[PDB]
Amino acid sequence: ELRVGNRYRLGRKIGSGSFGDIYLGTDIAAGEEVAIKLECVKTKHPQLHIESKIYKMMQGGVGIPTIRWCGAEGDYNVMVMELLGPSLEDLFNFCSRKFSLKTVLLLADQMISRIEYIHSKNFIHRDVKPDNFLMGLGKKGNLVYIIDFGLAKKYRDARTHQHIPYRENENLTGTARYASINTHLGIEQSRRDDLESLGYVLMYFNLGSLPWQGLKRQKYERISEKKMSTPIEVLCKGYPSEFATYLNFCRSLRFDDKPDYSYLRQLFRNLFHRQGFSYDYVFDWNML
């Protein structure tokens, strides 16, 4: 009877993340299903324990899943996590690659806040993308959660807020489709880069696709050439100027700058209200 420590029965694979696979679990002790992350202990650079400490620093924030680091069982490090609902990439597909402007702005408000909270606890996420935001369950079905801290990194000192130095970091960490221009140029990531990636995620929702998507490491330069050759004003054309304004404000932030989260939220909130929408948490998937 294959269980993690007498408590959660292990089920089928339900996803991949950074640095391991995710499996379904059943808490016979409570009554809920859980997600179970497993990492093969045979590596010189194990990551699961580290990732679960970041989760522990983020507990109590809105939209942060609760986890439980259960240590090593033979060949695997185990971390039990709150099972949430579908990812935004999943919901985008239910909705046939179309989100209403209201839904995008409903998401923008929450995704900006999630990123702000992470930054408040001194980490940058480094892989902002639609698969790493999931809707909650039940009474939390209106709530956007952020997940996967396996590429996350401390960007400032916890007691003195000394920001990490500006330096060339030459590993592309994260998905290339949403990577900031600073990352394509080999610069260490900071808070500005999480938000620029959110800017691309938003326009991806609006367009259904990005101009650097289906491009035939050669492909990684192809994306970066195309991403830099494509001015912001062309990428966001035929959509409210606020998306262009968002993206320009992210690219113009200084490396160590504390982003103005209220400003970005207010761009979208004011456009939201001018269209007459109400923050009622009725997304496109709430009308089937």
Side-chain angles (χ1 to χ4, degrees), residues 88 99-114 133 135 141-144 198 202 205-206 243 265 268-269 271-273 277-287:
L88 290 183
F99 277 163
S100 72
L101 172 68
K102 179 187 175 183
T103 284
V104 170
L105 294 166
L106 280 171
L107 295 169
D109 195 66
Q110 282 203 52
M111 284 160 104
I112 293 163
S113 302
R114 300 302 159 254
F133 295 90
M135 303 304 304
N142 56 316
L143 209 72
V144 182
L198 183 62
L202 290 188
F205 285 155
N206 282 337
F243 297 97
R265 269 189 305 261
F268 290 143
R269 186 160 307 169
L271 167 69
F272 182 92
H273 282 149
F277 306 135
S278 167
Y279 284 105
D280 53 25
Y281 296 92
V282 173
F283 308 84
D284 287 356
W285 50 87
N286 290 129
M287 286 89 45

Side-chain angles (χ1 to χ4, degrees), residues 78-91:
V78 175
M79 182 179 77
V80 178
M81 323 168 44
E82 197 168 14
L83 183 104
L84 300 151
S87 79
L88 290 183
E89 187 72 40
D90 300 333
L91 289 163

Side-chain angles (χ1 to χ4, degrees), residues 1-262:
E1 295 64 34
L2 193 292
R3 300 183 183 97
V4 278
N6 186 109
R7 198 150 111 185
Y8 315 97
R9 150 197 336 130
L10 260 158
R12 75 181 269 165
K13 186 165 153 168
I14 59 168
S16 319
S18 58
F19 297 113
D21 301 286
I22 301 167
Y23 297 82
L24 185 75
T26 307
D27 195 352
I28 313 114
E32 333 311 315
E33 323 301 312
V34 301
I36 297 187
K37 197 163 170 173
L38 300 193
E39 178 203 38
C40 175
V41 302
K42 314 199 186 118
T43 166
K44 300 190 75 159
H45 299 286
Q47 297 288 318
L48 191 59
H49 195 23
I50 288 163
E51 178 187 5
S52 98
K53 278 208 269 199
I54 306 166
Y55 273 119
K56 276 174 283 235
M57 307 205 226
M58 315 285 189
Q59 307 283 257
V62 184
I64 304 280
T66 36
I67 71 106
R68 283 202 68 265
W69 161 259
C70 292
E73 314 223 304
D75 281 341
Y76 286 107
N77 295 319
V78 175
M79 182 179 77
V80 178
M81 323 168 44
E82 197 168 14
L83 183 104
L84 300 151
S87 79
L88 290 183
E89 187 72 40
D90 300 333
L91 289 163
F92 199 45
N93 295 318
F94 297 150
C95 291
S96 319
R97 208 132 289 267
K98 263 90 166 41
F99 277 163
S100 72
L101 172 68
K102 179 187 175 183
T103 284
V104 170
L105 294 166
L106 280 171
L107 295 169
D109 195 66
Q110 282 203 52
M111 284 160 104
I112 293 163
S113 302
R114 300 302 159 254
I115 288 161
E116 181 185 348
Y117 179 86
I118 308 296
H119 291 169
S120 85
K121 307 311 221 210
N122 314 303
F123 285 87
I124 47 165
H125 181 291
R126 285 161 99 203
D127 201 22
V128 164
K129 80 179 155 178
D131 267 319
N132 284 335
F133 295 90
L134 327 184
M135 303 304 304
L137 289 187
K139 156 199 203 214
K140 307 286 205 192
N142 56 316
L143 209 72
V144 182
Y145 287 72
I146 192 166
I147 65 147
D148 205 330
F149 291 108
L151 313 152
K153 169 186 177 141
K154 201 190 271 196
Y155 76 91
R156 75 183 173 187
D157 183 280
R159 330 192 228 295
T160 76
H161 288 184
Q162 184 135 248
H163 200 288
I164 61 178
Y166 187 115
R167 78 171 221 112
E168 166 207 354
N169 176 304
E170 208 61 57
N171 325 127
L172 205 153
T173 326
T175 309
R177 183 188 291 168
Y178 309 112
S180 78
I181 302 267
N182 303 319
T183 302
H184 286 301
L185 297 166
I187 296 298
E188 182 87 81
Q189 287 175 54
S190 46
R191 293 171 287 192
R192 70 193 173 161
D193 304 286
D194 281 354
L195 287 170
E196 193 186 331
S197 290
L198 183 62
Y200 300 136
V201 163
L202 290 188
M203 278 299 307
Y204 166 90
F205 285 155
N206 282 337
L207 299 158
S209 147
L210 288 177
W212 44 87
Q213 207 149 315
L215 284 178
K216 204 184 210 113
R217 66 151 115 233
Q218 229 268 149
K219 165 224 208 244
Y220 260 68
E221 225 245 277
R222 286 278 312 275
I223 286 183
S224 98
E225 309 186 43
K226 187 51 183 164
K227 196 181 268 153
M228 298 179 216
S229 304
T230 314
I232 282 139
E233 289 74 22
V234 190
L235 168 75
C236 317
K237 172 185 115 103
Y239 289 98
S241 72
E242 276 74 3
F243 297 97
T245 305
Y246 181 87
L247 271 166
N248 281 304
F249 179 96
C250 284
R251 298 221 55 260
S252 79
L253 280 165
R254 275 185 259 106
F255 173 79
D256 62 345
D257 252 357
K258 171 166 190 146
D260 196 348
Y261 302 98
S262 306

